[PDB]
């Protein structure tokens, strides 16, 4: 089966595990249980050409439970950087994660995901992000709570990775 290694990265409590565990058919996890090291989750996406499989390495965001930080990043073919739009601290640390990824993965395609865009008083606005100026980089507003643009990062990455810009998602 056609599959890719995706390293999911971002500050603690930004909603990585919730995101992945939302994609794995389930409720909206209200609890915040910090990830220890990494949790690998297979995500299958049906396309007009067949099923793709993203092996999502959901890594920890907190320094205290990071584990093998860069140790997970090798062999990775793509990545998702996530942060909280209601916490500029998590947005400020994006280029650090970015540099962390780049130092191991030269120039893989990467999507920046501005999570929690359902919460009022958005401190980090979409019209401020200049992260995705480059070709291999993308940005998306997402909501693990309302499933807003939740499939889009994977579609963009899938398009970039397979090489078909007209790739589509189907069901199921």
């Amino acid at each position: 089966q056609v599959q890719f290694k995706l390293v999911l990265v971002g500050d603690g409590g930004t909603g990585k595990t919730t995101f992945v565990k939302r994609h794995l058919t389930g409720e909206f996890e209200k609890k915040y249980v910090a990830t220890l090291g990494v949790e690998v989750h297979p995500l299958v996406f049906h396309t007009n050409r067949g099923p793709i499989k993203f092996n999502v390495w959901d890594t920890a965001g907190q320094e205290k439970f990071g584990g093998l930080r860069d140790g997970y990043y090798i062999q990775a073919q793509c990545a998702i950087i996530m942060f909280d739009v209601t916490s500029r601290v998590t947005y400020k640390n994006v280029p650090n994660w970015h540099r962390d990824l780049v130092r191991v993965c030269e120039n893989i395609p990467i999507v920046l995901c501005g999570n929690k865009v359902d919460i009022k008083d958005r401190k980090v606005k979409a019209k401020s992000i200049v992260f995705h100026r480059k070709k291999n980089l993308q940005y998306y507003d997402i909501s693990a709570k309302s499933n807003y643009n939740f499939e889009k990062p994977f579609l963009w990455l899938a398009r970039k990775l397979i090489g078909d810009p007209n790739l589509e998602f189907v069901a199921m």
Binding site: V38, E39, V40, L68, G71, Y72
Partner: peptide, 18 residues
């Protein structure tokens, strides 16, 4: 860690190497 298809195994290895 790097080649076990089983996620659980990867996690075990990650912890051990951890």
């Amino acid at each position: 860690l790097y080649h076990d298809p089983d996620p659980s195994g990867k996690e075990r290895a990650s912890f051990w190497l951890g």
